[PDB]
Design a protein around this ligand. Structure first.
Ligand SMILES: *[C@@H]1O[C@H](CO)[C@@H](O)[C@H](O)[C@H]1NC(C)=O
Lengths: 49, 50, 124
């Protein structure tokens, strides 16, 4: 752990990026995460919601 | 079958999917939760019961 | 939803006369909505007349049509009638057989589907 200070910097930003992509999977209360699927399953008038 | 004795089927590739049922009866309910009824043809429903 | 409506009837009624209409239904619908008539008085806005529940559990009437209007659905050919008793002389309107595609009518203004106008004059 001699180079602890630099190692955490590489860990923090990389793991923050990995959470950001991983945030894409959550449905956030919608039908599905993949918005192409939503555009294919539901009709456009009721897919905006 | 009776309401208590309702059946189950595991459709999996044979002839054609839809656009036939769109008249099978003069008047029939077509309530769809999720998939839009008009968009029922070019999707790919994997696990489907009847 | 895509629902086709088959309304027919009418004629030339008289002051104190009556009508016995019909409105058949055919076509897939999102839900089993209520059939009925939205008649606009001649030159007026489209007004609810009398609505029957698709299960034949709810009946509706209005003051302009109370005592001289009634809606009933045929149990054989599924053609909902508009049969009345002593319709007055002012109903010289065109009657659209509208279609609320909802199971319950909170308000009658949003009328998903509609029908054809039935033009009947009232004079001898
Ligand atoms: C049975 O229903 C189907 C539904 O699409 C339609 O082809 C027709 O009304 C009937 N024919 C068959 C396959 O028995």
């Amino acid at each position: 752990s001699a180079l602890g200070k630099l190692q955490d910097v590489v860990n923090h930003n990389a793991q923050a990026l990995n959470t950001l992509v991983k945030q894409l999977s959550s449905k956030f209360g919608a039908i599905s995460s993949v918005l192409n699927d939503i555009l294919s399953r539901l009709d456009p008038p009721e897919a905006e919601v | 079958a009776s309401v208590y004795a309702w059946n189950r089927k595991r459709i999996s590739n044979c002839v054609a999917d839809y656009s036939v049922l769109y008249n099978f009866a003069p008047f029939f309910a077509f309530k769809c939760y999720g998939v839009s009824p008009t968009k029922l043809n070019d999707l790919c429903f994997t696990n489907v019961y009847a | 939803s895509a629902v086709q409506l088959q309304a027919s009837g009418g004629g030339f009624v008289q002051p104190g006369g009556s009508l016995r209409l019909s409105c058949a239904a055919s076509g897939w619908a999102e839900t089993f909505g209520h059939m009925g008539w939205f008649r606009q008085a001649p030159g007026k806005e489209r007004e609810f007349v009398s609505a029957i529940d698709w299960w034949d559990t709810v009946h509706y009437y209005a003051d302009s049509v109370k005592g001289r209007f009634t809606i009933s659905r045929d149990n054989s050919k599924n053609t909902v009638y508009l049969q009345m008793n002593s319709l007055r002389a002012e109903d010289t309107a065109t009657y659209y057989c509208a279609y609320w595609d909802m199971d319950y009518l909170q308000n009658s203004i949003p009328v998903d589907y509609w029908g054809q106008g039935t033009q009947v004059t009232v004079s001898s």
